[PDB]
Amino acid sequence: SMKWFRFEQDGRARIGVEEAGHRYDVTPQVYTDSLLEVIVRGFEMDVDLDVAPRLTDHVRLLAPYLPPRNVICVGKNYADHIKEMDTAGAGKFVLFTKAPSSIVGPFDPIERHADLTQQLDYEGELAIIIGTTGRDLTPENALEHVFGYSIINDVTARDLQKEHVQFFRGKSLDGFCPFGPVIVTEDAFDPADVLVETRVNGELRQSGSTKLMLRDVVTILTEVSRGMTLEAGDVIATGTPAGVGHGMKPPVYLQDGDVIDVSIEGIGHLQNQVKAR
Amino acid sequence: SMKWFRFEQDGRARIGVEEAGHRYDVTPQVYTDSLLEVIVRGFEMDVDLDVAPRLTDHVRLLAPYLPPRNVICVGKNYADHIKEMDTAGAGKFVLFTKAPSSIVGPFDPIERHADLTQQLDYEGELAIIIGTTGRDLTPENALEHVFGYSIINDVTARDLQKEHVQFFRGKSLDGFCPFGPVIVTEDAFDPADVLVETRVNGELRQSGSTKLMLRDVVTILTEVSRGMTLEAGDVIATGTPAGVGHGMKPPVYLQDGDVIDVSIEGIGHLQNQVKAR
Ligand SMILES: [Mg+2]
Ligand SMILES: [Mg+2]
Known part of the structure; x- marks a missing residue:
């Protein structure tokens, strides 16, 4: 169950996903800070976990x-x-x-x-x-x-x-x-x-x-x-x-x-x- | 006074202005193909119609x-x-x-x-x-x-x-x-x-x-x-x-x-x- 979100870091948008209970920052693999851009492009950018962070719960989500x-x-x-x-x-x-x-x-x-x-x-x-x-x-x-x-x-x-x-x-x-x-x-x-x-x-x-x-x-x-x-x-x-x-x-x-x-x-x-x- | 418009030339969008019923290509003086970007910028970049090629041919107008x-x-x-x-x-x-x-x-x-x-x-x-x-x-x-x-x-x-x-x-x-x-x-x-x-x-x-x-x-x-x-x-x-x-x-x-x-x-x-x- 891949879930997509935008979250705040340094007053600036980043992109995150959620598979079985933890929140990985995927911005690097997907090459953008716009989740709209990820949707419009109409392909998933071959992202593989066991690579990128696992930041805290007090991370602060933005509107998608x-x-x-x-x-x-x-x-x-x-x-x-x-x-x-x-x-x-x-x-x-x-x-x-x-x-x-x-x-x-x-x-x-x-x-x-x-x-x-x-x-x-x-x-x-x-x-x-x-x-x-x-x-x-x-x-x-x-x-x-x-x-x-x-x-x-x-x-x-x-x-x-x-x-x-x-x-x-x-x-x-x-x-x-x-x-x-x-x-x-x-x-x-x-x-x-x-x-x-x-x-x-x-x-x-x-x-x-x-x-x-x-x-x-x-x-x-x-x-x-x-x-x-x-x-x-x-x-x-x-x-x-x-x-x-x-x-x-x-x-x-x-x-x-x-x-x-x-x-x-x-x-x-x-x-x-x-x-x- | 300058009326603003958008037109097609070789299948690309261009910005024109209309003065006294004559139409000029001003894309090279406003440095974009988008009339929305001109208005979102929030300021008039000065246009010399002397250096603007007049459009003499029929041209395809687009929606602004x-x-x-x-x-x-x-x-x-x-x-x-x-x-x-x-x-x-x-x-x-x-x-x-x-x-x-x-x-x-x-x-x-x-x-x-x-x-x-x-x-x-x-x-x-x-x-x-x-x-x-x-x-x-x-x-x-x-x-x-x-x-x-x-x-x-x-x-x-x-x-x-x-x-x-x-x-x-x-x-x-x-x-x-x-x-x-x-x-x-x-x-x-x-x-x-x-x-x-x-x-x-x-x-x-x-x-x-x-x-x-x-x-x-x-x-x-x-x-x-x-x-x-x-x-x-x-x-x-x-x-x-x-x-x-x-x-x-x-x-x-x-x-x-x-x-x-x-x-x-x-x-x-x-x-x-x-x-x-
Ligand atoms: Mg309702
Ligand atoms: Mg009405």
Whole structure:
């Protein structure tokens, strides 16, 4: 299970991988500090371990990369109490984006923006990382265009969503797209039945298998790419399970100090704190 | 005053400038093949048109550049009558994006996507080009952040608008963002009252002044950058005057072989033919 990440050394990006529990610095074998560059190139640079470091756990991960275009996001994509027949709520295939300016990496603060929002909310999500440019993907070739998977927190201003009608602005304020901590390779990861959970200050809020997805990974790839080219390094956020602050009775919104922990089994933890400034 | 453009010569991209309707190759004086790199640099490198070879032959214009993130687009932003504007502005500020993969140059065909849309339509628009990274712009610094202005055709599958609810998909099919033909500098262009016109197969379909804009250029800049960072090379499409094919009695939609001409006085013309591909 090769996992890819970027980590910080001397205020400067380096690249690391993870096979069975330890973190080797692979920058030398792969000849770049851009993990986007590693994906776009569309080959793995014949890296062999038992050669390069094994640095400490307090190493500090960065966002995998700055997406070259807006993060593509799916709307309601999760069934609640599994069954629910062949539906959950309407069932339109809803697509919108998040400006790359909104990306932050692991443990980075989420800017609170109290002047702009009093309904700040979380959404824990499985992210598809596109490895090969293509269009009109089929069930047979879809996964061949996937480099791997990561976590997105689709942070959202529920009031800006209605105020600007289209979701773009309320999802795109600086800080609103935690991304990371690592990319697990397509070969090392089956998205059929993985657990997506969110904790806020330690309280379990979201806990849903990818088996509850109304459109699975292959269907998302198939539908998204119809008449629209996907670029190498595209990030597709595949929706969020039940338990969103807005959907709670009564509704609960994120405040200055709140710590959000999104986890996906096989990938890891993306934790960010809401902080004012 | 110098308008900026990009063109193809022996299959390589080149930078040109247009002065008094004459076109010159300035690639050797700005030392790049990318109009985005010129604007991202953040400063005017002095150009002597005396030493610039004039382009006398027909030349292939390209789109000014591939935007480094999605084109930011404003929804309903035009009044119909000059004084149908008494607090009409007080409508919702609707913001959505178009994928850069939808961009095409002036005189590039628009892919028909017959299999996906039966309601292909047009929107002629003034585009703002951002020159300097910025956030929380003010009426008094906003225009300092603006490199220039250009033209966008916000080609729209009205049926995909309704089907996917959020406009992204219906506005982002390959071929749906005609961009160009040139960028006029902020120095040399006042958007307060310039005429926007669209013709389909020669027949006038839109004709409106930027004086009918519900929110003007400076207001758009103030409201879009509120808690969201703008990047140099950001393109903001500022909305479309009355006369779109969806809003006509009876409704009219674009077919194989339709030619659309979009005109903005002081910029030029964007002519694209819809073609089954
Ligand atoms: Mg979401
Ligand atoms: Mg438009």
